[PDB]
Amino acid sequence: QLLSQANEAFVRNDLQVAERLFNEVIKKDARNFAAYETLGDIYQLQGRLNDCCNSWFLAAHLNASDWEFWKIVAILSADLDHVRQAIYCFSRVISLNPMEWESIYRRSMLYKKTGQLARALDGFQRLY
DNA sequence: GGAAACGGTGCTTTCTGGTAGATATGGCCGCAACCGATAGTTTAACGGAAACGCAGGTGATATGA
């Protein structure tokens, strides 16, 4: 009922009311992905990117099946210097589907920045 | 009323040999240090156990499909 009312308010562009209703559920469960599927949109549009990335990452630990999205979670985590989290997100991208080859390259930049090259080398051989 | 002549031996002196510490040089023995190597975390990421959810052996109530 709360999730329907919050998503209805989101469709009405009543984003603060939508947030207040999603917060009634998030207060009971901080990992409630069913709220973040649209509350994350509110947080991204309002520039709350620090809270937005965490809303994706902590809930997606459980809700990992939207696998293409882990690339976006990894990218934003790296832009915010949450580098462990960025590598952990790219791991799920590659573990769920290796064919997202640009993700191997992007992850290899994190490896280049910190000297973690032994993980990049076999990956670049596969890319080549 | 005393000083000058010089015999007594007490007290002292170098020539030396003794006592015996000292060390330039020497040869063992083993401490100070380095590059070396074995063992250490904890996690990439997915191989594993324990943890996890739906079936099938009956029955069969409704009224729609």
Side-chain angles (χ1 to χ4, degrees):
Chain A
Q1 183 172 21
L2 283 167
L3 298 178
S4 193
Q5 288 170 345
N7 280 293
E8 291 154 41
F10 169 84
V11 168
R12 292 191 300 97
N13 307 305
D14 199 2
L15 310 193
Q16 291 184 356
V17 170
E19 168 172 36
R20 285 167 181 168
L21 292 162
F22 289 127
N23 290 345
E24 302 300 345
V25 188
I26 289 161
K27 185 171 181 177
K28 297 183 180 181
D29 183 2
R31 311 307 187 92
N32 187 51
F33 190 74
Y36 304 129
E37 281 196 320
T38 50
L39 180 137
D41 305 356
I42 299 173
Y43 280 37
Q44 187 177 14
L45 289 166
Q46 295 187 346
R48 313 194 198 181
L49 296 180
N50 288 286
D51 296 340
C52 194
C53 193
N54 281 284
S55 300
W56 307 333
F57 177 65
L58 297 171
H61 273 64
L62 318 181
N63 290 74
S65 59
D66 195 9
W67 87 105
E68 301 183 323
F69 199 81
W70 285 121
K71 180 185 174 188
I72 300 174
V73 192
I75 285 167
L76 184 58
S77 302
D79 291 346
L80 298 174
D81 303 328
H82 307 159
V83 184
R84 303 180 194 85
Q85 174 176 316
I87 295 164
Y88 203 2
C89 291
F90 280 129
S91 81
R92 287 191 276 248
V93 181
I94 296 164
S95 183
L96 295 165
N97 198 335
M99 196 264 289
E100 299 302 327
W101 296 329
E102 184 178 318
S103 315
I104 301 173
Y105 158 69
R106 288 180 179 267
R107 183 186 71 166
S108 299
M109 191 189 188
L110 306 183
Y111 297 167
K112 180 68 176 87
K113 285 180 177 189
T114 58
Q116 300 165 353
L117 312 188
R119 294 177 173 84
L121 180 58
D122 300 338
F124 276 121
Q125 287 180 358
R126 292 158 187 179
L127 285 178
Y128 194 73

